[PDB]
């Protein structure tokens, strides 16, 4: 459509692109040092990396709206799924897919087909149960949609490397007023 095509258009602009292997290795080194440092407290590394995600969730959306001059997102579901479907691909070149709604499409899921944060990680046998590898995305999406005044509530429910076959995030949208003076 308009938005779908200008995603591949606005991939080609001024600030250069670098290979995802560096970005994956940096993220793996951060999560390995934080898993080593808190003595295998996998619950605590989840919320620490969550706040690590949310503190650039506060600051991602200004670069997103500046580099992609985009209007207000009046529909709260279908515009949201198509903007996140192009809006990963502007930052980290991936195209997630969207299913698994509510009755009113409220707690919708976002299935990521392939994850560049862990291409090649086999997380260890003690770390099966109280850890998700990539909750920084749950930080940065909740920040990046709280700054457009949409009180989301993301959480992982399944991934690849905890054992399951699909990587998806369910999200409850509460509501919040006082945007600006338009």
């Amino acid at each position: 459509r308009s938005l779908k095509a200008m995603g591949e258009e606005i991939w080609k602009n001024k600030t250069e692109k670098i290979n995802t292997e560096l970005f994956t290795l940096t993220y793996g080194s951060i999560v390995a040092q934080l898993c080593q440092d808190y003595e295998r407290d996998f619950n605590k590394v989840n919320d620490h990396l969550y706040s690590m995600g949310y503190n650039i969730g506060c600051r991602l959306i200004e670069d997103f709206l500046a580099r992609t001059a985009l209007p207000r997102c009046e529909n709260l579901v279908k515009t949201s799924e198509v903007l996140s479907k192009c809006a990963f691909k502007i930052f980290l070149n991936i195209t997630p897919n969207i299913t698994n709604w509510s009755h009113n499409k409220d707690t919708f899921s976002l299935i990521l087909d392939e994850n560049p944060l862990a291409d090649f990680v086999e997380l260890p046998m003690d770390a099966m149960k109280s850890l998700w590898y990539s909750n920084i995305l749950c930080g940065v999406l909740k920040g990046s949609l709280e700054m457009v005044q949409l009180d989301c509530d993301v959480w992982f429910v399944s991934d690849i490397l905890r054992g399951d076959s699909q990587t998806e995030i369910k999200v409850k949208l509460n509501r919040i007023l006082k945007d600006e003076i338009p």
Binding site: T15, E16, I18, L22, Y27, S29, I56, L60, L92
Partner: protein, 203 residues
């Protein structure tokens, strides 16, 4: 093959192909945006100014990440450059210092930042010290670099490219505006005397 247990096992007279997770490892290309990785680095440096006391311990607590993944990038960057895997050969290892700091100059920057650092100057007054200057550093271009403590990601990442190589090495960074290229950073590295003396046996 546990540390507690012995090297004990069983005979070869079966075939257990019950395997789970092994794939390709080739040079994929996905090329995320510099804003995303810049935000990753940004909140990492925010955590390190949160949790750490003063200058030098923060410098070490930055360079340890480079020591985590420098070994990892060394061995398959060499396994891609000097060599699934229907392998012809694996070529020569580090002969001396001047091929392995050519190997950062040849294909580490062009593995990372799609260009080449502009010089690999052997020093005038001494030989244990060496110096590489990047001209316009890519991952720290937004940080106002008057404190030069923010580029010790890459001093950590090259130290773990040489600690596996058998050259223990004091690696520092300074920044010096010698050209119309502004904010170019010099990585004046050192070595220890002993592998300099292992070089100093014969050269």
């Amino acid at each position: 093959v546990g540390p507690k247990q012995a090297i004990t096992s069983e005979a070869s007279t079966t075939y257990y192909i019950s395997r789970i997770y092994s794939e390709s490892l080739l040079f994929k290309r996905q090329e995320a945006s510099l804003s995303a990785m810049a935000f990753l680095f940004q909140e990492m440096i925010s955590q390190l100014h949160r949790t750490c006391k003063t200058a030098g311990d923060f410098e070490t607590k930055l360079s340890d990440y480079g020591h985590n993944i420098g070994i990892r990038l060394l061995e398959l960057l060499n396994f891609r450059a000097s060599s699934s895997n229907y392998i012809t050969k694996m070529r020569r290892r580090d002969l001396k210092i001047l091929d392995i700091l050519q190997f950062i100059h040849g294909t580490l920057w062009s593995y990372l930042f799609n260009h080449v650092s502009d010089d690999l100057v052997k020093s005038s007054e001494r030989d244990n010290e060496y110096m590489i200057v990047d001209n316009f550093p890519t991952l720290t271009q937004f940080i106002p670099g008057e404190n030069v403590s923010c580029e010790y990601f890459v001093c950590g990442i090259i130290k773990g490219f040489l600690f596996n190589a058998g050259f223990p090495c004091g690696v520092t960074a300074h920044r010096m505006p010698q050209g119309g290229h502004s904010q170019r950073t010099v990585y004046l590295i050192q070595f220890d005397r002993q592998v300099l003396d292992r070089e100093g046996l014969r050269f």
